[model samples]
Target: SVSKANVPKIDVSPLFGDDQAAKMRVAQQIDAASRDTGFFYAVNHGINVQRLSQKTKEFHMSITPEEKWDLAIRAYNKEHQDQVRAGYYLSIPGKKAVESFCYLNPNFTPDHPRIQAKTPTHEVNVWPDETKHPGFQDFAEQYYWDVFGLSSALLKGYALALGKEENFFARHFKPDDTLASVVLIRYPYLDPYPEAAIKTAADGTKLSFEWHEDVSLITVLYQSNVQNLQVETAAGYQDIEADDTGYLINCGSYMAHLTNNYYKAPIHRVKWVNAERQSLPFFVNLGYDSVIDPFDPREPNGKSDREPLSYGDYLQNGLVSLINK
Candidate 1:
């Protein structure tokens, strides 16, 4: 049985302190492991555990089923009941779901056309704004800082693991670079699988999300007690256990490029089950303007030689194609 006490805990304090030998030892372990496993557990990451716990409790108490359906429909689909019956499953749904907001700069003084393209960033996210849910803003604010700190700290470890200067990732982020999104997903209990459940693909193995990879470098997933997260591995599809208390970290396309594909961005999916499940996935993506092409020349310079593509171009094209198709 995999338990939190049995699993390894990669400490961050020694790596962050002034102890040279300790830092090097931790770096060596991370470097070697990234090449093989492509992921690891991070403990003592200096996160505000109390704040996160309180917010989680607030999320459970403050949000409702009607609110969850409303946000999911507005953000993804309004005809969701029909869509679900037709095999269209929502990305992340809990009994209650919250709007994942982005933080942007209020004053960048740049009226430049290039910057103007991201005008949506300047506006506050569309929250419920009801007096009853006044605490949402506070919870969101706490969540933003806690998760952002964890992601930033992990990014630095990733840089070190990639043989780059420790601060290499620091330059890529800004106050406006906060594209943090948090999702609370729930899969409700059901009886025998419906015919539509079979078509959802998450319930079956044959024709599914396909062999595509993640676009982000790292995805921090906080899965609930009911487990159903699966990843394709050398041994086949392995179910990630929830009792581990360790957030499952997976490599993505950007990290694949950084390591020149030595460490892969594993394909993963959520499988449909009769029992319900829930999970929280916090995504920290590269700033929209950050180029995803190989950053290290020593890695695979020719790997990305197909063409020079901007992230904005890729995202815009992907969204349009998916919606239209």
Candidate 2:
């Protein structure tokens, strides 16, 4: 099991300041961590701590069957649920855990002008039926916007760290970009089952979420007190606990690709805990038409053999593969 010492913790308050030197200093630290582990803990990231924790708890409570019937409906009609839109995802019998996803873009609509123009991945925001969960939509949207803003700021730091203008990365996220999604995942307690009953991958190691790298640019995770998250390291697997005061930020495949492998995408997974564990992860991507290319300063001429791929094409291909599976 990995300990806290395995991953570095970086205080990012300087990224929120106006001083360029301070920003670059923080960026240097980010660069070091990204190169070494691809995973890190960020504290003082300018997020509202109380609001973050409270909203997460509120949303979890609101989704409980006793509180909202819409979740129940979606859970029961699993075959009809749309993964891109709002809907409950039932556990894959003994292999995975329950989860739900909702588009966080407030203005996203199927008939929106942008959708009609470019056919970006944007979809209408889904919500629990208003009658079943009053004010749920409004509350969720508020929290979404807050985290969205935080992500935008964090991306700026990443751009600076990569020796580019602060706005370099953000420029690709146009108004029409469907770049973010909020996933709420829950792992239930499995005490009733014998220790041997837990299912494992072909390799024989049990996992709530199999070892895999995220496909987004970066993934922002806010986990509850329950601790079962783990990340693979050269030494072995290490346990990572959620910090109530900060966000767990990890590099994803796109980020690694963008950096020409300068930033690695750490392979990570979740393990079953004795009690329920919930985590909120914001998957941040780029515009559908955005082309991913290496931005490493070391390469200066951008002369990498890696072929560029459009975000939309890559994402759609991945979705198709999942359907086939």
Candidate 3:
């Protein structure tokens, strides 16, 4: 049995509090944890579990096996090929028919030629056509609100974690800001590798996703109980058991930069499995022009000291590189 660690639960109420003492505990945890681990589990994050589960169930019911392949191959795959033909380096091909949509960046338009050319374009999300799934919008909106509440708390936590004022990140988000995007991911069963395979190193074993990290500061993923998720530890790659109502929060590469590379960007990835899997990832990023940088300065290398990166820069350069790799 996997035992939950005895970590302090950050109080959401302190975010709205006026007293410094009331906010002290939350700040302390954030600093200590982010500086050391860069990863931690958040309890009592204010998401309605029942509602989220209900919405996820609706999503699963709406997507059929054939529809999954159609949207994935016809839409996603064809789009990537088109981008390749147009000489755009952003779109790249993948082994499987994987499809994803973006809601945060407005540069992805419906009529953009790349929309039809690439397998993975950061274009606006393509729904299953409202006529096919009525009430999906209602469920999607509710789901977004619930996730937004959790994301708000997480940003505040990161600020406090960085020894900054609780409202440090609040300035970046606005009522109409397209700062959040949701991914309804589906990974079908593939062959060649069945049981969880391990790629090892001198210290530990790594899952197939390689030792790389994500570009985001934080990734909150709601994964199924499938047999692929794993994290690197001193012993080896240990599987991350699915929580019935909670999410697996992992630190990203940006957090490593923010912490001066002291806190590790833990190794994580999905291995091939026989059973099908679905995951919902809520990726929180800064607004369009928001500049992100590390707060530390003790390092000698200029690379460790500075580099101003924007969300657009990350999407264009960072994501494009990852896709090609």
- Name the lDDT value of residue 259 in candidate 3: 60
Candidate-wise lDDT, in order: 0.52, 0.68, 0.55
Model 1 per-residue lDDT tens digits across residues 1-325: 2112112346756655677567666666666555544555666666554455455555545666566455443245665432111111233432222233232222222563434664332223334455857676566656666666677766676666666666666456445654445555444454543434332444355321234466556776665556555556565665555433555666666666555676677766555555544456665565557664464435454344334454445444543454454
Candidate 1 segments exceeding 4 Å error: 1-9, 48-54, 57-123, 191-195, 198-212, 274-276, 292-309, 317-325
Best by TM-score: 2
1-325, model 3: which lDDT tens digit per residue?
Answer: 3222322334545654467665677767755655543445565666666665566566665666554443443334565333321111111223332333333333345664444453243344444567776787567666766776676666776676556676676566543443456666655445553333434444444334455577666777676766566565554555555564566666676566666766556666655454555677776665556665655634454245547666656645656576666
Better of 1 and 3 by lDDT: 3
Q: Write the per-residue lDDT of candidate 2 for residues 197-224, one digit (tens) a residue.
A: 3546554556555677786788887777
Clashing pairs in 2: 2-238, 2-239
From the highest lDDT down, the ranking of the candidates is 2, 3, 1
Cα distance off (Å), candidate 3, residue 137: 2.5
Regarding TM-score, does 2 or 3 come out ahead? 2
Rank candidates, TM-score, best first. 2, 3, 1
Error of 3 at 132 (Å): 2.0
TM-score for all models, in order of appearance: 0.70, 0.85, 0.71
